[PDB]
């Protein structure tokens with residue numbers, strides 16, 4: 139159900155040296171041997187060398203094989219920032235199995251979609267995290283007939299398979315499999331726009347290219363200490379350059395259990411972090427904690443680069459990074475579908491603070507077009523289209539959607555409005571896709587509406603983004619009741635019971651007799667645009 143690059147593009151990318159032929163199977167073996175004695179992972183009271191990570195993943199892989207996981211099987215991995223994540227991911231790569239990455243904030247609705255769409259053989263979860271019981275969630279899927287036949291729990295297993303069961307056998311490399319580098323190595327979730335998010339297949343060759351190139355752009359080496367402040371399996375903290383870039387270069391990955399200034403600054407001080415990645419709301423929290431007193435004492439001198447991305451970072455805030463934190467800002471504008479843009483570490487400050495970077499690859503093609511696919515004069519704002527050696531050509535098993543998201547000649551419609559500077563940098567100026575960006579977490583208005591409409595007291599609903607100085611947008615729901623409106627508390631509870639991801643629950647509920655817009659003779663997309671203007 140994947141879409142391949144055209145043969146003439148694949149040839150171009152291999153001859154250019156982007157696509158090298160290495161697989162993640164090769165990657166695990168080579169990097170853990172090349173850097174064996176160095177420190178690879180710090181988290182949860184654990185300190186693992188590359189050698190130990192190699193040994194642990196080889197044991198795990200043997201136990202997953204004994205469980206029934208074979209080459210090509212999809213396995214949904216929904217783990218917090220704990221060291222078990224990396225040994226689980228490396229193990230799956232050793233078997234030639236495909237991780238299917240879910241984030242900790244995802245819930246029954248999203249996990250059901252991933253398991254059924256990917257036909258997953260297993261689900262790997264923690265017992266509890268941030269007050270949520272993932273064992274109960276897995277049990278709900280089992281009750282509905284939608285759960286993978288294997289459920290593995292990190293922690294107290296309940297009635298499922300404890301992770302420790304997978305460690306019972308000595309390593310057996312006879313069960314490992316090396317896939318083809320052109321094959322999909324894993325699946326990840328898109329941001330989502332009109333409903334259920336599409337699955338994104340990424341290949342060994344194209345993803346490892348973005349990892350290698352990102353490690354070079356970001357000056358990574360064995361002296362790198364990368365703090366995973368964001369959920370590590372998101373594309374940004376996984377590959378831009380993320381923990382894979384760090385592993386590629388032989389550095390240390392430090393896991394932050396949460397991104398609070400107290401927790402993160404304590405790790406930066408203790409472990410001497412040199413680079414980390416955050417979304418704008420976290421960057422603002424860190425800046426405020428240091429500048430306005432709460433954390434001014436912390437020793438952040440080891441921090442060289444603060445990456446900020448996933449959502450728009452205002453120039454005003456960006457200008458605070460070096461004066462307040464003492465480090466170089468790097469803006470990162472990327473997407474799970476491919477294209478990643480970076481400001482360069484030796485760009486002038488005016489470029490670093492006012493742009494969202496330029497693409498990784500010389501073969502990243504950038505088209506900025508008007509509403510009729512005509513290129514806009516250089517400097518003007520238009521729709522961003524892109525094509526390149528690590529941008530996909532189609533979503534996983536999304537035949538009808540792919541016909542709309544990609545041009546006939548293979549350009550991906552990002553849904554972003556951008557303008558290009560003379561030096562190739564891009565400035566993100568708006569959005570055309572129907573998607574609310576809540577401080578880096580993407581919310582589909584139509585998806586939230588559909589669940590709201592399922593409540594028996596609701597007659598109609600419209601979900602829009604309301605401008606917010608810290609998150610960019612919050613999620614506001616306009617609701618028209620049939621007669622008496624439900625309890626705002628009640629409606630939000632009904633949405634949690636539905637299984638919506640935590641960040642998709644609206645911040646604001648406004649019950650109205652009618653939508654406060656003229657000509658309610660307009661499409662639902664235009665309706666949301668007019669409602670959002672009242673809130674901006």
Ligand SMILES: Nc1ncnc2c1ncn2[C@@H]1O[C@H](COP(=O)(O)O)[C@@H](O)[C@H]1O
Nearest residue numbers: 329447448449450470471472473474566
């Ligand atoms: N630096 C940035 N500035 C503005 N928007 C961004 C930035 N980075 C990512 N995005 C948005 O996040 C989307 C990708 O979502 P994700 O797949 O979560 O990375 C992009 O298409 C943009 O809408």
